[PDB]
């Protein structure tokens, strides 16, 4: 696992900031280097759960001019790719569900970081499960900030690079995140291999890119709150609910679909989760 930090300039007279960190809650901070300011902005409106490009307006944007198309941007816990930029109006197009992330609801006011080429990285390698305490010290022509005034924070490593990427294109009966399905349930997923992609950003809309050595797909079927069926070792690109268990579980108006990729018992950091509603003969004839 590797650690990185992002920051915003407090004043125009600040050039860069220094990175200081230590292992655990005890010890002496060891200087790791300096990094530049990361352009960032605030979402004026909520970002709905939808794959493909999405137009979003940014407020209080900083260093918007230096942003470039094709960069990798991270918000909350989702990594997105910028397709277009509007300097004057601060409107940009983001590709949802890229790299090892999946789309998620982001309320208004979420912070967007264009960390690509604007991050401070500590070259030391740290194992998963270790908690760190790091501080960022501003640097100016007048000198360096006194550590006593620097804010502190903690992070827990989770081996993000180790975990396999989750499935990509998640289409149900030809629809993306549908709340209406007419009877037969068809779910399609894409196979992502981290090694093959390398540094290329591929969104969910793209098709299969081949599997990874020893990587399979696992699906969990729930009854809204309870776990009923679990299918593991899936290697195809589609799955259908067998007719045998339909009677045993009966009609499931509220079905929760959970999708993730597992290899050697290593589950992906993120996963898909949505509760869908079924329609057709024998489903919702109260009306």
């Amino acid at each position: 696992s590797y650690l990185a930090a992002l920051a915003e300039a407090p004043t125009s007279l600040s050039q860069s900031y220094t990175l200081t960190d230590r292992v655990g809650s005890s010890g002496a901070f060891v200087d790791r280097g300096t990094g530049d300011w990361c352009p960032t902005g605030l979402l004026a409106a909520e970002l709905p759960l939808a794959a493909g490009p999405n137009v979003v307006t940014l407020t209080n944007a900083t260093r918007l001019e230096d942003v470039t198309v094709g960069q990798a941007a991270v918000v909350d816990d989702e990594i997105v790719r910028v397709d277009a930029v509007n300097y004057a109006s601060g409107t940009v197009t983001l590709a949802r569900g890229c790299a090892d992330t999946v789309p998620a609801k982001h309320l208004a006011g979420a912070r967007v970081w264009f960390y690509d080429t604007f991050e401070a990285v500590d070259e030391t390698v740290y194992s998963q499960g270790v908690t760190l305490q790091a501080r960022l010290l501003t640097n100016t022509s007048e000198g360096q900030l006194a550590p006593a005034l620097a804010a502190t924070d903690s992070l827990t490593l989770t081996g993000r690079q180790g975990k396999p990427y989750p499935p990509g294109q998640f289409r149900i009966n030809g629809s993306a995140y549908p709340t209406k399905v007419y009877g037969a349930l068809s779910v399609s997923w894409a196979k992502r291999d981290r090694i093959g992609q390398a540094d290329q950003l591929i969104d969910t809309t793209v098709g299969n890119i081949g599997p990874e050595d020893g990587a399979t797909v696992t699906l969990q079927v729930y009854s809204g709150t309870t776990l009923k069926r679990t299918y593991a070792g899936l290697t195809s690109s589609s799955w259908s609910y067998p007719l045998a268990e339909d009677m045993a579980d009966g009609p499931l108006q509220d079905v929760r679909l959970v999708l993730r990729s597992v290899r050697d018992g290593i589950d992906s950091w993120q996963q898909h989760d949505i509760t869908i509603e079924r329609h057709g003969l024998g489903f919702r004839l109260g009306e």
């Binding site: 007419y182 009877g183 007719l243 057709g280 003969l281 024998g282 489903f283």
Partner: protein, 55 residues
């Protein structure tokens, strides 16, 4: 012994129309007369002829 169960719900509307029409027909199983050929003209709703043409 024949059966029509377990319809994939995608084609559920056709089966719904089936349940409508056959149930509607079941009020009284009456045949206006036996026919060895399908009446090509002069037929409408409520007309039931026993098609006993060779085959």
């Amino acid at each position: 012994g024949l059966l029509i169960n377990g319809l994939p719900g995608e084609g559920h509307y056709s089966d719904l129309i089936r349940m409508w029409r056959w149930d509607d027909f079941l009020r009284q199983p009456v045949v206006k007369g036996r026919v060895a050929t399908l009446p090509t003209t002069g037929q409408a709703e409520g007309d039931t002829y026993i098609f006993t043409g060779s085959g």
